[PDB]
Design a protein around this ligand. Structure first.
Ligand SMILES: Nc1nc2c(ncn2[C@@H]2O[C@H](COP(=O)(O)OP(=O)(O)NP(=O)(O)O)[C@@H](O)[C@H]2O)c(=O)[nH]1
Ligand SMILES: [Ca+2]
Ligand SMILES: [Ca+2]
Ligand SMILES: [Ca+2]
Ligand SMILES: [Mg+2]
Ligand SMILES: [Mg+2]
Length: 166
């Protein structure tokens, strides 16, 4: 059966691990845990296709990771995650997209822009801003909450559907 290699990237603390664990185990990690497994596997049915999600949960570029570039090279699709209550994390997205462009040696990489923590009231990044950034990359924008599950399945399933177009 088909395997989709997904890589989750973005700034420290935007909720890369919380999103991936909410998808894989239907649990919200409500604390900072500095030692979470990077590799997740799940057999799922997406649009009538039985397939394997192979998910690599990376560290932010500010954190030193020796396995990051190995994870980068093998990725078929990328979730580029910022938090809607973290302007710096949104600004940082360009650097993650440039790194992806560098490693895939293409500007036509399957990607989804994810605005996480959409449950939180302290919004500093407007939907419109993120839509505009995603448009400039030729990719969809999806808002998620790792806490409430809003958009989580949609973010990962949309990325699979983007890989299928490539
Ligand atoms: N309210 C709310 N909190 C969230 C959401 N997603 C993550 N968090 C919280 O934000 C903090 C950081 O989450 P975490 O998943 O570890 O972020 P990360 O991007 O993997 N950090 P790192 O790059 O260091 O691995 C945690 O306390 C987590 O509970 C969300 O959607 N809503
Ligand atoms: Ca807990
Ligand atoms: Ca741990
Ligand atoms: Ca290159
Ligand atoms: Mg993490
Ligand atoms: Mg503003």
């Amino acid at each position: 059966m088909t395997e989709y290699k997904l890589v989750v990237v973005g700034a420290g603390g935007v909720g890369k691990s919380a999103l991936t664990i909410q998808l894989i185990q239907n649990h919200f990690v409500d604390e900072y845990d500095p030692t979470i497994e990077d590799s997740y596997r799940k057999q799922v049915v997406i649009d009538g296709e039985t397939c394997l999600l192979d998910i690599l949960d990376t560290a932010g570029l500010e954190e030193y990771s020796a396995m990051r570039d190995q994870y980068m090279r093998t990725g078929e699709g990328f979730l580029c995650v910022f938090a809607i209550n973290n302007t710096k994390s949104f600004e940082d997205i360009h650097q993650y997209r440039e790194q992806i462009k560098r490693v895939k040696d293409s500007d036509d990489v399957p990607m989804v822009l994810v605005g996480n923590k959409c449950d939180l009231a302290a919004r500093t990044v407007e939907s419109r801003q993120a839509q505009d950034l995603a448009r400039s990359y030729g990719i969809p924008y999806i808002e998620t909450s790792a806490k409430t599950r809003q958009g989580v399945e949609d973010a990962f399933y949309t990325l699979v559907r983007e890989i299928r177009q490539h």
